[PDB]
Amino acid sequence: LLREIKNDRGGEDPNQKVIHGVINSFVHVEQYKKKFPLKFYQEIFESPFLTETGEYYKQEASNLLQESNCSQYMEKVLGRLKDEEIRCRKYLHPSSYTKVIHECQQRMVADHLQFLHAECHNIIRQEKKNDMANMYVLLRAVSTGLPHMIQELQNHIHDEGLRATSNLTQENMPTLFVESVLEVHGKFVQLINTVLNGDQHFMSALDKALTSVVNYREPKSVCKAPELLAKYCDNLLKKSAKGMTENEVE
Amino acid sequence: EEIRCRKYLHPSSYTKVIHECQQRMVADHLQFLHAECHNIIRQEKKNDMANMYVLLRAVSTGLPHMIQELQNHIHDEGLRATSNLTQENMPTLFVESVLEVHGKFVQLINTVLNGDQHFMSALDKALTSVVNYREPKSVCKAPELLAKYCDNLLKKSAKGMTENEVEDRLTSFITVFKYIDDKDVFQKFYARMLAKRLIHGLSMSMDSEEAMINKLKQACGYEFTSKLHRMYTDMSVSADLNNKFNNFIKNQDTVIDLGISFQIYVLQAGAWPLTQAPSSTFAIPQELEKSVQMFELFYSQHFSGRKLTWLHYLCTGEVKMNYLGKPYVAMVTTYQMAVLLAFNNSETVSYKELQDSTQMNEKELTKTIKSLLDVKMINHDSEKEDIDAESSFSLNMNFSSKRTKFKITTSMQKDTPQEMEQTRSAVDEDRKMYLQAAIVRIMKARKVLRHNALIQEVISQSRARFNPSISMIKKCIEVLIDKQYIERSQASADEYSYV
Amino acid sequence: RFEVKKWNAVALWAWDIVVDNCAICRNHIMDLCIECQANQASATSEECTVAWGVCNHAFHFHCISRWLKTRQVCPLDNREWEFQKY
Ligand SMILES: [Zn+2]
Ligand SMILES: [Zn+2]
Ligand SMILES: [Zn+2]
């Protein structure tokens, strides 16, 4: 039974009805047991299967790192993870749907956090929107995966925000400063919404990174953000002779 | 009746007497007024229209029919004033005709029609329908013509256009630009033309470009012109960068002796529409390779953390040809300069030697030989002048042009339909990204909405940028399905859920 | 003989920050600086301390010192430089 599921993982398509029928026997025999109607199924097949899919996906994940970089490794893992959701759906009992996928994750993405976290810097910094939506859905399942992307996004927003509010012209500093934060805020709210599921753990990474750039102080000086945002209100709430209609101010 | 009730009645009954003198004298006969409204608007009779507007404004619900009739009249006038355009000069005359219509009808509304804000809104909607005259399911010619208009009037031309005329013309043009509702296409096209005009030195003045970017920023926002202002800022700081590089090479230990008048145009990667789409590996000539090495050293010393992607299809320079008596100095792209240096390597040269000396792809190479032969710089020694397997050709000794600074390249305009479609596809990708952002934001805010309300709120949110379609939105839901971020509701397909 | 007189060139600058790397030397921060990479026998391999700014950007002490001898601005983000650690 493990051989014709492993053969299914190799590409070939065996009899779906026969494999599902034999698997259903280990849980349909126990239908008259009032206590633990799946204890037979969870020891005859599921425990060997979870070990079989553990030593197979450990071998497959180690077989993917040799001839694939981190960019296309996640395309392959997501291809296997999506296939495994389909494969266990048509073969196993619905009780073992989560155990197979969760053990698949613990052999591909959770055992290779250090490989994914080391390349998580280049994914965030270069703004690879396709790879950032793959590193997310791989590290979202792992409990300890996101807290490094969250730091690398916060470090990216803080460096992008600081670079955007740098060396502003003295003529229009109150207006340049506000619009420089709003383009960083506007870009990364959309980037988090499109790519990182609009996650609140990442919106808090943006707010904790935009707070540092707004409250950034020059050496032996004071934070000029309250003064600059006081003039920005003053600049557009005066009687604007040139443009700045009523609908634009509001 | 107003003066009569003023001289006879109490002050508290001035309005009520007039209200019953209008609600039963021009509101009970409102059908006749509304029926003649279409004719009195289309004929454009001033005093009659003014009296008609006063009477309909007196009636509580007699004015919006006049609004619709006037809006339809403006739509028809704009359509008949913009559908007769020829291809001789479309970008100028299209915007000029739209300006004439807008100015004439603003004067008509403000002078003989009290300047009502409802009529201004109707005029704005009518002109929005006019300039966005989508030829059915084919194109939207407005943003491309507006971008071409800006490029034409900002390009350094010998026809004669003073600075003040250009400035007031752009100030007028912004009124046309305010209602395009496809501003992403115009942004990408203006970015492409701005890149070409800044790099090739076709700008009449940096002040004009900065003023136009400021006008667009005031029209839309800082997020619209952030990339354009970064392009302009890089082009302004290029002079300081050249001065700093010259100071760097003067303050080194030994004499570097570049041998060329190097003048770099380091550009920010994310802010410019340029890209390394021609991924052919180009072999830099040695005398340029020394300058490339020295500028890499400078840009790794005076700037840190920046890798410097070299563009070999935006580069040009002057080459001398003292081999045949030094007749002139030729401005030439570096792709063609490489094969000119290969000609310098050996007079008898074949295509294989060009391939091993430039390492570049065959399509760009064949383009360089074509763009050299059409200007009769070189002659093909083979039987046929076009491309073939052998392709052995040497220098032409019969080139006797009368220009001491003759230029053999003219790819300053380009605008081939392939890159036009590539630009439109980039707009489509950005539109898809914005629609995904809106969908995810709305779902995260509410988590329960229907299809029609979702479409309406997407249209309302993205009204100021473009006019999104249903298929693009459904493609965005499909992409979020593939990324397992969205899901329709199990109870009904109309509602939506969250993963 | 063809002689090139001008080479007006266009290049795109993009950020090339890699993890745990000194931006001036383009090498790892825990390794020695490129200024102290030469004459390594004279260098004691101890004075190349890692200097961190208040912008959380880490260089070597010698590299950021030589940087500050020309301009008082951080390279990776164009803000002024404040030491916080060593
Ligand atoms: Zn260093
Ligand atoms: Zn050192
Ligand atoms: Zn820094």
Residue numbers in the entry:
A (entry chain A): 163 to 412
B (entry chain B): 246 to 744
C (entry chain E): 21 to 106
Task: Copy the relevant paper text.
We recently discovered that FEM1B, a substrate receptor of Cullin 2-RING ligase (CRL2), recognizes C-degrons containing a C-terminal proline. By solving several cryo-EM structures of CRL2FEM1B bound to different C-degrons, we elucidate the dimeric assembly of the complex. Furthermore, we reveal distinct dimerization states of unmodified and neddylated CRL2FEM1B to uncover the NEDD8-mediated activation mechanism of CRL2FEM1B. Our research also indicates that, FEM1B utilizes a bipartite mechanism to recognize both the C-terminal proline and an upstream aromatic residue within the substrate.
Unexpectedly, unmodified CRL2FEM1B adopts two different dimerization states, with one symmetric and the other asymmetric. Unlike dimers, dimera adopts a ring-like architecture, with the two CRL2 protomers binding to each other in an asymmetric manner. Specifically, the C-terminal hydrophobic patch of FEM1B.p2 interacts with α17 of FEM1B.p1. The C-terminal hydrophobic patch of FEM1B.p1 in turn associates with RBX1.p2 to seal the ring, with Ile546, Phe549, and Leu550 of FEM1B.p1 forming hydrophobic interactions with Trp35, Ile37, Ile49, Met50, and Trp72 of RBX1.p2. In contrast to RBX1.p2, RBX1.p1 does not contact the WHB domain of CUL2.p1 but associates with the middle region of CUL2.p2, providing additional interprotomer interactions. Therefore, Lys689 neddylation disrupts the assembly of the dimera by introducing potential steric clashes.
